[PDB]
Amino acid sequence: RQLVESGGGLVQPGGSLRLSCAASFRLYDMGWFRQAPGKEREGVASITSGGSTKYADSVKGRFTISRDNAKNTVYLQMNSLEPEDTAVYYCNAEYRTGIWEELLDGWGKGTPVTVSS
Amino acid sequence: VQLVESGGGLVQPGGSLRLSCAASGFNFSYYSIHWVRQAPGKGLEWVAYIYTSYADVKGRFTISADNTAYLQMNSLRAEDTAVYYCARGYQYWQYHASWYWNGGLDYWGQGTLVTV
Amino acid sequence: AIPVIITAVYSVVFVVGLVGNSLVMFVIIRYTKMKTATNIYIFNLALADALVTTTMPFQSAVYLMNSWPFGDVLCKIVISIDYYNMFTSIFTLTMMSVDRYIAVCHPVKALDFRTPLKAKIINICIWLLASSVGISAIVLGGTKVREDVDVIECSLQFPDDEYSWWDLFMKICVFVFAFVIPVLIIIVCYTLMILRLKSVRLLSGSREKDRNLRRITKLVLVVVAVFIICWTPIHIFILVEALGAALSSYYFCIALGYTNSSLNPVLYAFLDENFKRCFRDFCFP
Amino acid sequence: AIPVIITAVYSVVFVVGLVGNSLVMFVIIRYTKMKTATNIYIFNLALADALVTTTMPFQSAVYLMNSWPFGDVLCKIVISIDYYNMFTSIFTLTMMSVDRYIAVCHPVKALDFRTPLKAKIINICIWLLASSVGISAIVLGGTKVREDVDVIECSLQFPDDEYSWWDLFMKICVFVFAFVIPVLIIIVCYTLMILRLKSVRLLSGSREKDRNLRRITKLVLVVVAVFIICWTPIHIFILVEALGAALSSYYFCIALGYTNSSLNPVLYAFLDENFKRCFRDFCFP
Amino acid sequence: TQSSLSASVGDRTITCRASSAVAWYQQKPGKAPKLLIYSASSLYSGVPSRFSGSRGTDFTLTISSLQPEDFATYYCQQSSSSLITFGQGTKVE
Ligand SMILES: CCn1cc(CN2[C@H]3C=C(c4cccc(O)c4)[C@](C)(C[C@@H]3C(=O)OC)[C@H]2C)cn1
Ligand SMILES: CCn1cc(CN2[C@H]3C=C(c4cccc(O)c4)[C@](C)(C[C@@H]3C(=O)OC)[C@H]2C)cn1
């Protein structure tokens, strides 16, 4: 399968962004990870199939994530973007190749996002 | 995160040498490693990265990776003498490369002296 | 009318199916790794298939000269083996489907019920339950000379006064108790298993165990589906003839049903990693 | 895929060979014109050839899989069947030659020695005499796993200390008592018979009886001369291996020797007019 | 393309003319390079706020107030399709 990310663009501080991670037989756990140049990989959101959502301490109250089961695609909404959020967002995905196949973890290519203008 | 470079010694012109970099404190699969040299009394200049590329050094240079990175030297020239630095960057740095993003090389070693 | 086609098919079955099923049974018996419940049921399937491929040279003596030169005892044994194979294969497939359904939808009871010793007991119970037709065919089997063409035929001999009623009754009972009801049970089990798989296909989470379980379930599904499409034409043809170029279609249906005894080892080799590894080890140690 | 494809001899022939031998036996048993001493010995030949034919998949699983997955009991049964066939065939052919010599060179005594009941008794004692190695094969036969390649071998199991000598002694005795003496007896009998036929060639008696006598003798001669051009390479190869591309020649000699179980019905159909008529009547009544 | 600058402590501007994003590196004499500005507008962690980078086509770094420790060569790194090239370098004395 192929993992595609988008929604990375230059944004002024305080703006809003909407990411998009899609794959193309069904997706199970689909998370969002940020990696700053001077920081280790850190997860910000993680949504299960049933709609249960988990958020990081810094991400709480500003980050919204939902799962579209029809198209197997995620959008995660940036609210109140700050320069401290300047990093690359990686799409960690759990998926099954086929109904009679093993469970596998899919890693997206990664998209760059900078809060600057 | 610490980086160690080794393997630099006195090499006659036209000789061969191997440089090794030590990676510790991070997942090697999630990052790319690059080699940068600075000739004495001169500015910095890229060597190669390990998904491989070479400067227009192409053909004369070969790079490989293992949690170690190996650089292959063949038919060394007189101008190849410089201090080689080991730096770590984004694994998909070329894919992330664009008009608004430049991650850079966060962590550098101490430099390895190669004389010819 | 070229007779070497179905005869060559019968000979290929007679050798290759016997060799493959014998290999499967030997691998299951020898290796302690391969002593699982589904493997025990596969052993029973291979045993039935290997038994039915022994009588292949006796089957091909019809359609070559259209008579029975082997006598009453051999006719009885051949009919008994045919009925044993027909009933045992479908009953073993039904029990395989039920075992997979228990392993998938009721994992709590799978630990208690899916022990290999229980699978062995179920295999003996299947052989004894299908013995009601094997022993009946031994008792009723025989040879009767045709009084219009001087041709000996090997078939079941019901009383002459009610041959028409007994023949239709036996063919009807075989159709419902060996095709319809087991197929319905298999369909129900696999519908429930597919529903459970898809529902947990959102959030299935144990890598090795789920991988093995789904792989074995797919293997069992393919085996059942191949049996279904190999044994369907003959059942329908027999039912239609009993109730309602035909001889060309008749012997194609018979040959198609017998070829199923040879495809099981191929299916196991192509759809199972452990079976393929054991086959490679046996062939090239 | 060549070994599987080249196996088609082991399947198509033998499947055909079993049918032909069974048809020969049925023709001899059923028809009342078919009960003569020569036909009783032919029945013994056909019985042995039909017994050995059913074990062909058990040599196809070997030779192809290079190992024996059928276990100790099936190994014993197959070895016993092989030795029984190899002994009984040559002993029955020797009795055929002796009976033909009695019928031709000594017509006075042939009126009582060639009774079909006497032929059946002689067949029974032939089978009992062949039980010296037929039962010893059951007792000594077994499976032994190779100590260096993990391949199961099916063969006779002599004591390990003097196996070396026991195997050579057994092979020497087998060659002497199954090939040398019977072939010498056949050669002597047929030399005397041919001398007598040549002497009376210009002065033959009644033409109706002479035709049948010469026709049956020229059939027995062809059967014997096929048995000993088919079973000659295997004996010679085995003896030269015990005493002194080889593997390819080994499997060709084995295949040729087993092929002899299929050519007998064809020879009977071609040469014996009564057998040809019975075959035609049974195939197309 | 960027050579020599003379200024006192407490004086405010170096331009590295090229259009991908750029990064600034500082290297003391006989010392390993360190990253200061990444993505041409973001300050690296642990870096004083004096350094700031601005984008039209000529990126430039501005220092609010010079310090005695802030005396070395500044290098500009620019990306491309498959290569990154460091700048010539300017040294402030
Ligand atoms: C020369 C080949 N031949 C075989 C036979 C008789 N056999 C064939 C047909 C039968 C049958 C099958 C399904 C439903 C039913 O009511 C009866 C048997 C019970 C099984 C054999 C078969 O079809 O297995 C592929 C048996 C009497 C006649 N001719
Ligand atoms: C898989 C095929 N295979 C068969 C065997 C062993 N058989 C072959 C060779 C034998 C033999 C024959 C003459 C003299 C002698 O001393 C031995 C047997 C007795 C008969 C078999 C055969 O040749 O009949 C055509 C038997 C032990 C090994 N491999």
How far lies C23's CA from each of C189, C250, D103, in Å?
30, 32, 52
In chain A, residues with a C-beta closer than 8 Å to the C-beta of C214 are: 99-101
Contact D169, D78 (CB under 8 A): no
How far lies A107's CA from each of A23, B51, D127, in Å?
11, 17, 76
- Three-state SS at C147: coil
Distance from CA of A115 to the nearest CA of E (A): 8
Give the distance, in angstroms, between the CA of residue B41 and the centroid of all CA atoms in the same chain: 19
CA–CA distance, C139 with C147 (Å, rounded to integer): 23
CA–CA distance, D115 with A80 (Å, rounded to integer): 116
Query: What tokens does E28 get?
Result: 């003391």
- For residue E11, give the nearest of E67, E54, E53 by alpha carbon: E67
Interface contact A98, partner B, CB < 8 A: no
What Å resolution does this PDB entry report? 3.2
Task: Count how many domains chain A has.
Answer: 1
Task: Count how many domains chain B has.
Answer: 1
DSSP-H helix ranges across chain C: 4-12, 18-30, 37-54, 56-59, 72-105, 107-113, 116-129, 131-140, 163-175, 181-200, 207-243, 246-271, 273-283
CA–CA distance, D104 with D97 (Å, rounded to integer): 11
φ and ψ of E69, to 5 deg:
-75, -25
Length in residues, chain A? 117
Eight-class DSSP state of C150: -
Long-range contacts of A18-21 (CB under 8 A, 24+ apart): A18/A75, A18/A76, A18/A77, A18/A78, A19/A74, A19/A75, A19/A76, A19/A78, A19/A89, A19/A91, A19/A111, A20/A73, A20/A74, A20/A75, A21/A73, A21/A74, A21/A91, A21/A93, A21/A108
CA–CA distance, C35 with C30 (Å, rounded to integer): 9
Query: What tokens does A106 get?
Result: 């899919």
- For ligand 1, the distance from its centroid to the CA atom of residue C281, given in whole angstroms, is 37
Contact C100, C193 (CB under 8 A): yes
Contact C224, C188 (CB under 8 A): no
How far lies C104's CA from each of C45, C92, C141, C217, in Å?
22, 18, 43, 9
Q: Which residues contact E5 (CB under 8 A, 6 or more apart)?
A: E14, E90, E91, E92, E93
Contact C233, C213 (CB under 8 A): no
Distance from CA of A41 to the nearest CA of B (A): 9
Among E4, E84, E85, E91, the strongest candidate for a mutation testing the B interface, having the largest count of B CBs within 10 A, is E84
Quick check: CB of D114 below 6 Å from ligand 2? no
Is E21 close to B36, i.e. CB distance below 8 A?
Answer: no
Touching chains A and E? (3+ Cβ pairs < 8 A): yes
Eight-class DSSP state of C67: S
Query: What tokens does E50 get?
Result: 């004096």
Among E24, E25, E38, E42, the strongest candidate for a mutation testing the A interface, having the largest count of A CBs within 10 A, is E42
Pocket of ligand 1 (CB under 6 A): C 59, 62-63, 79, 82-83, 86, 171, 174, 234-235, 238, 254, 257-258
At D143, which helix (H) or strand (E)?
Answer: strand D141-145
Q: What angle do CA C134, C140, C145 make, to 5 degrees?
A: 130
Q: Hey, which residues does B64 pair with through a beta bridge?
A: B70
Distance from CA of A115 to the nearest CA of B (A): 10
Interface contacts A/C by beta carbons within 8 Å: 33
Touching chains B and D? (3+ Cβ pairs < 8 A): no
Interface contact A28, partner C, CB < 8 A: yes
CA–CA distance, B79 with A14 (Å, rounded to integer): 50
φ and ψ of A95, to 5 deg:
-150, 165
- For ligand 1, the distance from its centroid to the CA atom of residue C62, given in whole angstroms, is 12
CA–CA distance, B37 with B79 (Å, rounded to integer): 11
CA–CA distance, A43 with A34 (Å, rounded to integer): 6
- For ligand 2, the distance from its centroid to the CA atom of residue D85, given in whole angstroms, is 11
Domain coverage including residue C177: 4-283
CA–CA distance, D92 with D166 (Å, rounded to integer): 27
Burial class (CB in 10 A: 0-12, 13-18, 19+), C69: buried
CA–CA distance, A101 with A25 (Å, rounded to integer): 9
CA–CA distance, D225 with D218 (Å, rounded to integer): 10
CATH number of the domain where residue B106 is located: 2.60.40.10
Is E83 close to B43, i.e. CB distance below 8 A?
Answer: no
- Three-state SS at C32: coil
D180-193 burial code (b ≥16 CB/10 A, e <16):
eebbebbeebbeeb
- For residue D86, give the nearest of D181, D11, D174 by alpha carbon: D174
In chain A, residues with a C-beta closer than 8 Å to the C-beta of B95 are: 109-110
Residue that the structure tokens 């491989």 belong to:
B52
Quick check: CB of D110 below 6 Å from ligand 2? no
φ and ψ of C157, to 5 deg:
-115, 90
Handedness of CA E42, E44, E46, E52 (dihedral sign): negative
CA–CA distance, A58 with A63 (Å, rounded to integer): 9
In chain D, residues with a C-beta closer than 8 Å to the C-beta of C285 are: 67, 149-151
CA–CA distance, C135 with C139 (Å, rounded to integer): 6
Contact E54, E48 (CB under 8 A): no
Method: cryo-EM
D71-98 burial code (b ≥16 CB/10 A, e <16):
beebbbbbbbbbbbbbbbbbbbbbbbbb
Q: Which residues contact D128 (CB under 8 A, 6 or more apart)?
A: none
DSSP string, D84-142: HHHHHHHHHHHHHHHHHHHHHH-TTTHHHHT-HHHHHHHHHHHHHHTHHHHHHHHHHEE
Neighbours of chain C (3+ CB pairs under 8 A): A, D
Eight-class DSSP state of C204: -
CATH number of the domain where residue E68 is located: 2.60.40.10
Q: Which ligand is nearest to the CA of C82?
A: 1
In chain E, residues with a C-beta closer than 8 Å to the C-beta of B101 are: 21, 39
Long-range contacts of A76-80 (CB under 8 A, 24+ apart): A76/A18, A76/A19, A76/A32, A76/A44, A76/A45, A77/A16, A77/A17, A77/A18, A78/A11, A78/A15, A78/A16, A78/A17, A78/A18, A78/A19, A78/A113, A79/A16, A80/A14
CA–CA distance, E33 with E23 (Å, rounded to integer): 12
- Three-state SS at B82: strand
Is A38 close to E44, i.e. CB distance below 8 A?
Answer: yes
Half-sphere exposure at residue D1, Cβ-oriented, CA atoms within 13 angstroms: 1
B37-76 burial code (b ≥16 CB/10 A, e <16):
bbeeeeebebbbbbeebbeeeeeebebebeeebebebeeb
Contact D32, D116 (CB under 8 A): no
Order of strands across the sheet that contains E14-17: E14-17, E58-63, E51-54
Q: Which of A9, A37, A114 sits opposite B106 (nearest CB)?
A: A37
D47-59 burial code (b ≥16 CB/10 A, e <16):
bbbbbbbbbbbbb
- Three-state SS at E34: strand
Please state whether beta strands B107-108 and B82-90 pair in parallel, antiparallel, or not at all (unpaired): antiparallel
Q: At what angle do helices C246-271 and C18-30 cross, to 10 degrees?
A: 30
| Atom from ligand 2 closest to the CA of residue D82 | 20
Quick check: CB of D63 below 6 Å from ligand 2? yes
Quick check: CB of D190 below 6 Å from ligand 2? no
Q: Which ligand is nearest to the CA of D85?
A: 2
D234-273 burial code (b ≥16 CB/10 A, e <16):
bbebbbeeeeeeeeeebeebbbebbbbbbbbbeebbebbe
Residue that the structure tokens 């029984």 belong to:
D84
Q: Which residues contact D55 (CB under 8 A, 6 or more apart)?
A: D77, D78, D81, D82
- For residue B34, give the nearest of E24, E79, E74, E89 by alpha carbon: E79
Contact B5, B33 (CB under 8 A): no
Q: At what angle do helices C72-105 and C207-243 cross, to 10 degrees?
A: 140
Query: What tokens does C234 get?
Result: 């003959």
Query: What tokens does A16 get?
Result: 């809003």
| Atom from ligand 2 closest to the CA of residue D156 | 27
Q: Hey, which residues does D156 pair with through a beta bridge?
A: D141
Is A40 close to B30, i.e. CB distance below 8 A?
Answer: no
Domain coverage including residue E74: 1-93
Contact A77, A59 (CB under 8 A): no
CA–CA distance, E36 with E47 (Å, rounded to integer): 6
Q: Which residues contact B34 (CB under 8 A, 6 or more apart)?
A: B46, B47, B48, B49, B50, B86, B87, B88, B89, B105
Is A102 close to C207, i.e. CB distance below 8 A?
Answer: yes
Contact B111, B83 (CB under 8 A): yes
At B21, which helix (H) or strand (E)?
Answer: strand B18-24
At D152, which helix (H) or strand (E)?
Answer: strand D152-156
CA–CA distance, C285 with C219 (Å, rounded to integer): 26
Q: What angle do CA E31, E33, E39 make, to 5 degrees?
A: 165
CA–CA distance, E79 with E22 (Å, rounded to integer): 7
- For residue B102, give the nearest of E41, E58, A110 by alpha carbon: E41
Contact B2, B25 (CB under 8 A): yes
Quick check: CB of D235 below 6 Å from ligand 2? yes
Instruction: State which residue of chain C sits closest to A67, comparing Cα positions.
Output: C202
CA–CA distance, A97 with A1 (Å, rounded to integer): 8
- For ligand 1, the distance from its centroid to the CA atom of residue C130, given in whole angstroms, is 16
Interface contact A43, partner B, CB < 8 A: no
Rg value, chain C, Cα: 20
Interface contact E47, partner A, CB < 8 A: no
Q: Hey, which residues does B54 pair with through a beta bridge?
A: B48
CA–CA distance, C261 with C81 (Å, rounded to integer): 13
How far lies B109's CA from each of A56, B48, B90, C65, in Å?
33, 16, 16, 89
**C21: number of Cβ within 10 Å:** 26
Domain coverage including residue B89: 2-116
- For residue C45, give the nearest of C235, C264, C255, C215 by alpha carbon: C264
Which amino acid residue places its CA nearest to atom 3 of ligand 2?
D59
| Atom from ligand 1 closest to the CA of residue C155 | 27
Half-sphere exposure at residue D204, Cβ-oriented, CA atoms within 13 angstroms: 14
Distance from CA of A117 to the nearest CA of C (A): 41
CA–CA distance, C34 with C57 (Å, rounded to integer): 32
In chain C, residues with a C-beta closer than 8 Å to the C-beta of D11 are: 8, 11-12, 14-16
Give the distance, in angstroms, between the CA of residue C2 and the centroid of all CA atoms in the same chain: 28
Half-sphere exposure at residue E26, Cβ-oriented, CA atoms within 13 angstroms: 17
Domain coverage including residue A94: 2-113
Is E42 close to A38, i.e. CB distance below 8 A?
Answer: no
CATH number of the domain where residue D208 is located: 1.20.1070.10
Of chain B residues 14-73, which have a CB less than 8 A from chain E? Answer: 36, 38, 43-46, 53, 55
Is E32 close to B85, i.e. CB distance below 8 A?
Answer: yes
Interface contact B79, partner A, CB < 8 A: no
In chain A, residues with a C-beta closer than 8 Å to the C-beta of E20 are: none
Which amino acid residue places its CA nearest to atom 20 of ligand 2?
D82
CA–CA distance, C63 with A21 (Å, rounded to integer): 64
φ and ψ of D177, to 5 deg:
-90, -5
Among C198, C212, C214, the strongest candidate for a mutation testing the A interface, having the largest count of A CBs within 10 A, is C214
Task: Count how many domains chain C has.
Answer: 1
CA–CA distance, C207 with C196 (Å, rounded to integer): 17
- Three-state SS at E50: coil
In chain E, residues with a C-beta closer than 8 Å to the C-beta of A86 are: 39, 42
| Atom from ligand 1 closest to the CA of residue C257 | 25
